[PDB]
Design a binder for this molecule. Structure first.
Ligand SMILES: N[C@@H](CCS)C(=O)O
Ligand SMILES: [Zn+2]
Ligand SMILES: [Zn+2]
Ligand SMILES: [Zn+2]
Length: 288
């Protein structure tokens, strides 16, 4: 368990924040949802710089730029599976390079992690379906969609998988099943919500937690890409269902002002999602 060493030593583990904000500030034009294919090729040094930026701000875990990096997605750019897996692997390499750089600068930084981002099938559909979850695939189809990215992230040396922004229960099942075929893998599963007690697709959270409790490789559960004002209620509900470390990284509003409420509700992995920047991580660091 990549988390145990850190969680044995401190209550809170800080995540990072959004990649896009920082790349745009540095001059990047992110024209479409497949922007990672371009930036990983044309400006990989800027991605590495942003990861380094977040470690400096206090992040102890970087999330790779692979949220929309799948062979399915990247086929629209003329890339085949192997080419796509190369770029997925590269996203891990750049975060690992940033970790090497920071630990050279600050050897006293403690343990630092790299989490491979695994986004939902909805993000590939690119119709904002990662928030509705109303799509239908067989278990095999979900698993075929996710498998190459899981393999590429693990082979490139991700410490764990960030299975995130997940709106669909059947896909969550397929993904938990898929991970058992990689016995060394560890993951967190983070969800988008319809309300404080339901998945985006309508599933009661008690059912999601109950399902995932049977998979030991899932070492944390939580919420991300949700409005600030909707976080605490959701966490408090999860807090009554599990004592797995809870994950929370919401969209930008102050984000760091919530740290005591969140921690009291069992959150132990805390960062930022959309429109957050290293300023949010720096604020969290100061309040912890
Ligand atoms: N790509 C983001 C999630 C967008 S909802 C991430 O990797 O955390
Ligand atoms: Zn439907
Ligand atoms: Zn089937
Ligand atoms: Zn988000």
């Amino acid at each position: 368990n990549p988390l145990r060493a850190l969680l044995d030593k401190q209550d809170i583990l800080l995540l990072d924040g959004a990649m896009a904000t920082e790349l745009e500030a540095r001059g990047c034009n992110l024209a479409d949802s497949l922007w990672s294919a371009k930036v990983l090729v044309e400006n990989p040094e800027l991605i590495r710089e942003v990861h380094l930026d977040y470690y400096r701000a206090g992040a102890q875990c970087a999330i790779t730029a692979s949220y929309q990096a799948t062979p399915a997605g990247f086929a629209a750019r003329g890339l085949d599976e192997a080419q796509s897996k190369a770029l997925i692997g590269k996203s891990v390499e750049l975060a690992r390079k940033a970790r090497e750089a920071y630990l050279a600068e600050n050897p006293q930084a403690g343990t630092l992690l790299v989490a491979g981002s695994v986004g939902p099938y909805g993000a590939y559909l690119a119709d904002g379906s990662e928030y509705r979850g109303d799509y239908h695939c067989s278990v095999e189809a979900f698993q075929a969609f996710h498998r190459p990215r899981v393999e590429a992230l693990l082979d490139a040396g991700a410490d764990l998988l960030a299975c995130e922004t997940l709106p669909n229960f059947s896909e969550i099942e397929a993904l938990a099943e898929l991970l058992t075929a990689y016995p060394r893998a560890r993951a967190w599963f983070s969800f988008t919500l319809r309300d404080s007690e339901h998945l985006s697709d309508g599933t009661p959270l008690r059912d999601v937690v109950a399902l995932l409790a049977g998979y030991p490789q899932v070492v944390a559960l939580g919420i991300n890409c949700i409005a600030l004002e909707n976080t605490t209620a959701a966490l408090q509900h999860l807090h009554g269902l599990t004592v797995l470390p809870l994950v929370v990284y919401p969209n930008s509003g102050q984000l760091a002002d919530y740290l005591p409420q969140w921690q009291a509700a069992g959150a132990r992995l805390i960062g930022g999602c959309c429109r957050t920047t290293p300023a949010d991580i720096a604020a969290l660091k100061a309040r912890s």
